[PDB]
């Protein structure tokens, strides 16, 4: 449906910035599966974050404190 948006050359670019030389065809669907479950976990944090504040928008503070919640926090959008 809309899960092929991260198509084969995008995963190839992610592999080339990740350090892997040769790519087999079965890597792509597994990488987009772990991407669509990892972003599912982040959005699963963000929905409870939004419904807590009675606020229907998701800001950069939402995802930054959510990454702080799973212990993979990121600098640049608040601390």
């Amino acid at each position: 449906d809309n899960i092929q948006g991260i198509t084969k050359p995008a995963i190839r670019r992610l592999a080339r910035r990740g350090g892997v030389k040769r790519i087999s065809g079965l890597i792509y669907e597994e990488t987009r599966g772990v991407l669509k479950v990892f972003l599912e976990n982040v959005i699963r944090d963000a929905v409870t974050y939004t419904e807590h504040a009675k606020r229907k928008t998701v800001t950069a503070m939402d995802v930054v404190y959510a990454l702080k919640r799973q212990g993979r926090t990121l600098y640049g959008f608040g601390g």
Binding site: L14, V20, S24, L35
Partner: protein, 96 residues
């Protein structure tokens, strides 16, 4: 002229030199839109949020592909298979 591979070495050198995003913005916010509308109804979003999950996704992709690179090097192989990423997620505690 025609090589088995040398363009990949220049590509990985240029990508380790550069710092630009290699994931297109429109399919990314489209897929997080589909996930958000699958979870709840009628949500609003900000742009700094979606470049923040773009940064999180590219950092997680870089970490996982470094993990699969080290696992493939220790497996004495050049081509990568999903067994390495499965063992990488099992070892790191992502799935169990």
């Amino acid at each position: 002229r025609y090589r088995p591979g040398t363009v990949a070495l220049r590509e990985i050198r240029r990508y380790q030199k550069s710092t630009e995003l290699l994931i297109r913005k429109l399919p990314f916010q489209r897929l997080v839109r589909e996930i958000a509308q699958d979870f709840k109804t009628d949500l609003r979003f900000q742009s700094s949020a979606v470049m923040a999950l773009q940064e999180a996704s590219e950092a997680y992709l870089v970490a996982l592909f470094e993990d699969t690179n080290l696992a493939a090097i220790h497996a004495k192989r050049v081509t990568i298979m999903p067994k390495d990423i499965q063992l990488a997620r099992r070892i790191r505690g992502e799935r169990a």
